[PDB]
Ligand binder design. Sequence first.
Ligand SMILES: [Zn+2]
Lengths: 63, 201, 510
Amino acid sequence: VLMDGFPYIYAPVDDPVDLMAAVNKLINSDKYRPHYGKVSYRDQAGKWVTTKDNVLMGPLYMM
Amino acid sequence: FGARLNATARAVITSISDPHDYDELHIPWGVGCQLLKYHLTNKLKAKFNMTTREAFSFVYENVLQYNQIIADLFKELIAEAAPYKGMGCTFHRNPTLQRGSTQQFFITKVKDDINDNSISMSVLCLKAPNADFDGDQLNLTLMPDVYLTKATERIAPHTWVLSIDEPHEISGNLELQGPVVETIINWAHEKYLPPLEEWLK
Amino acid sequence: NLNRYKARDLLNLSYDDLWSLPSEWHLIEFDDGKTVVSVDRITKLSVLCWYPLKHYKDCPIPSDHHIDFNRILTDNPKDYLNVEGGRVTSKAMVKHLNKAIWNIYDWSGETVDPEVLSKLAIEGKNWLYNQTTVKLSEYLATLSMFDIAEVYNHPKVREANHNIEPTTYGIEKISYGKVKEVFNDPTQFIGNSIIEGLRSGTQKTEQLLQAFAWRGFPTDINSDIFKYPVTTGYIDGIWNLYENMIESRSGTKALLYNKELLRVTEYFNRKSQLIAQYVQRLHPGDCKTTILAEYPVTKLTLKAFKGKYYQKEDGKLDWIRGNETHLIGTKQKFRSVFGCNHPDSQGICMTCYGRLGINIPKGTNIGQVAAVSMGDKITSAVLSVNMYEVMKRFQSFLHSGTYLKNYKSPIEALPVFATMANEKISLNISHCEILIYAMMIRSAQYRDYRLPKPGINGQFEKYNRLMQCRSLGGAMAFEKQHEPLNNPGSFLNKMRNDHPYDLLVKGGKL
Ligand SMILES: [Zn+2]
């Protein structure tokens, strides 16, 4: 896990898990709550700005 | 009642999301070299004293690679179309039913990246032709002279603004896109001030 | 406290100055004598929508131009202290631009070219896009599972998913009703990305209800319903074989034989446009005709009468604004296409057409506009009682194969067609008159197939006979081009109307 930098997750189609119950657990957890803060980027005017809202960054499999 | 015209192009489209004018068009490098072959040949012969054979060889050689000399000529051609913003052209979307599926634009820029083979279109003129980015190849036709450029002004983008269904109303084609509206309402309707009663204390 | 600004003064500021106004409650003073209490951000957005008025310095700005035009400062503080202002939508921004251009048009005395205003409107929208996307780069909206949890965890949303009768009434009315009540409460979900978009029209309740409430009853490929419903929303998921399989039939229903639909719609659009093009020009002015038209006004066709001039009492002309409910159930005398006396043998005046002719760009074939308007709405509905049957019904009525040729006068036929058209789609009366007028001939006995002038002295004819006997240029562009060449009548010197395709048949010669 440390070398890869990511724990690979086995998620079978017939997994007996309540999805929104799992989401609620993660939000209310002191251990596994994902970082939820602002982000900074350079806009189309060339100015370095930071967002007012909290933005979450996550992975997606793209092809 | 139909024809396959000369001086035409066909490619997929993308968006111009940066600050821009609604009636301007950006064409890819490869399309620019082949479409404007005789415009470039005229400039090369005069400025660089090339022969016709050398000019034709020079243009075809640089279709698939960037060339600084060609890039300078492209801007000079666009800047010489004054008082128009650029070179007049018409963009067609199929099937053609309503006014808006055929629009007149001005070529104002030839893209410097050769890996992009799409014609960038203004985001304010996508609703009228019902154009999307999912495999939509549009047809471009270059206007040869000023006489036809004035004639095709009748299908300029502003000509579909007023609604043809209800009097004294603006068509729904002018409404902003989803992502822009969400940003505005996130700003305008934020509770950043106390209620007016508390403001007066 | 409560700094005061003038509407015209704000419009004269530079863009940097406008965006530098303080964050505050303030008073905007308008030229109609009223004042509006609002916040700076709503004021800044409203000023950007007033761009056309920048080019006309003497045009007064009434208070309805502001977005929060309902919060008017009065003597009694109980009328503005707790008043909720307007909601910013993509449609609302267009409407305020619409208000500006027609305010200029009315103030000028109907002397400003509408093409000038249309250019100002799109330019103003362009400026709004340029400024907002650059200045508001810090206010981007975002979505994540954090936003989903906010809506999902609401107590009333969670109660509309338990103890529900698995029936159409129990799901679609009771369970869906509770969720709609929560989503419409202005005090709930403040700052939520999903809900704020719903209030501004970005989202729609139909998709959201199937996501947060029970999915309901999907149909099979033959439009047959199933006895049992889907007892779960999309967010929770559908993980049992029966409900998952029946839900898949919706995706099967999504993909259909649109290739045939495209073929039929294209043929219908081509057929109607070719014949409609015989009515070419729309001249501005008034022809001063004493011929009016008596039409019934109903609750279904009142909206379709917008812009039509009707002679009220004391012999004066007024035009329908769309809210004259007192006229429903009566009969009025309208200025109609069928009564025009314009010298042009294929044209009409602005007054007989109605106020909708102001929006038409100069020099446009008026017949094509009517056909495009009808075709656009039918095609949109057909591709997205079947609308295919509706399209076939309109086609058979107009082309006479309860046919248009049955009626003896155009006046008696318009309400029948207007009711038929406005029951499914929304078609203006001006468009309806043009389409019916195109099917009219002067004298069937003498084979004079030119348009009648005025249109009340003519008769109706079938589509096929008209397309082959009016002008050979139009005939050469539809079907069976060999047949008109064999017709003996094609060789006899007659007075005939012209078609736009005449020039292309001769290759450009005159
Ligand atoms: Zn008239």
